[PDB]
Write a protein that binds this ligand. Structure first.
Ligand SMILES: *[C@H]1O[C@H](CO)[C@H](O)[C@H](O)[C@H]1O
Ligand SMILES: *[C@H]1O[C@H](CO)[C@H](O)[C@H](O)[C@H]1O
Ligand SMILES: *[C@H]1O[C@H](CO)[C@H](O)[C@H](O)[C@H]1O
Ligand SMILES: *[C@H]1O[C@H](CO)[C@H](O)[C@H](O)[C@H]1O
Ligand SMILES: *[C@H]1O[C@H](CO)[C@H](O)[C@H](O)[C@H]1O
Ligand SMILES: OC[C@@H]1O[C@@H](O)[C@H](O)[C@H]1O
Ligand SMILES: OC[C@@H]1O[C@@H](O)[C@H](O)[C@H]1O
Ligand SMILES: OC[C@@H]1O[C@@H](O)[C@H](O)[C@H]1O
Lengths: 48, 45
């Protein structure tokens, strides 16, 4: 399965998705969390 | 008749006060966070 929104996984063959730190968001499964663009915000660590 | 002994030199004011203290100096720049560890390999099969 792909990582749920708010989670990322940048390694192969793992069984856990890691949560993205504050200031970054992430849609459905992605290699890395992408920083919020200029002018927008994300407070928590489960930000999607 | 001749005048009296002329007066002395009058004193100066009682001198002003000192300057108050300064504000609290600001804080150091907020340090940055560390680097993400490398991408680990696959777990044991
Ligand atoms: C004081 O003054 C008078 C005149 O005003 C006179 O010259 C005296 O000789 C002097 O001592
Ligand atoms: C000093 O003061 C006296 C008066 O006390 C007089 O005016 C003198 O001429 C002056 O030098
Ligand atoms: C200041 O003091 C001197 C003498 O100490 C003199 O009397 C002046 O007249 C006074 O103003
Ligand atoms: C830190 O800054 C303040 C001024 O706000 C003050 O000059 C202190 O002496 C300085 O160390
Ligand atoms: C690392 O982070 C701190 C605060 O986030 C600061 O901006 C530094 O300039 C940066 O290199
Ligand atoms: O906007 C992202 C897309 O819609 C949703 C999923 O994350 C993807 O299919
Ligand atoms: O500590 C330095 C001195 O502290 C006090 C004054 O702000 C400054 O001259
Ligand atoms: O923050 C501390 C105090 O409140 C503020 C003032 O500059 C200082 O005196």
């Amino acid at each position: 399965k792909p990582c749920q929104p708010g989670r990322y996984q940048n390694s192969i063959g793992q069984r856990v998705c890691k949560p993205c730190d504050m200031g970054t968001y992430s849609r459905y499964g992605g290699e890395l969390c992408t920083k919020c663009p200029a002018g927008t915000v994300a407070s928590k660590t489960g930000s999607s | 008749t001749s005048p009296p002994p002329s007066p002395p030199p009058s004193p100066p004011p009682p001198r002003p006060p000192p300057p108050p203290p300064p504000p609290p100096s600001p804080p150091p720049p907020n340090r940055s966070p560390p680097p993400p560890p490398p991408a680990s390999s696959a777990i044991n099969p």
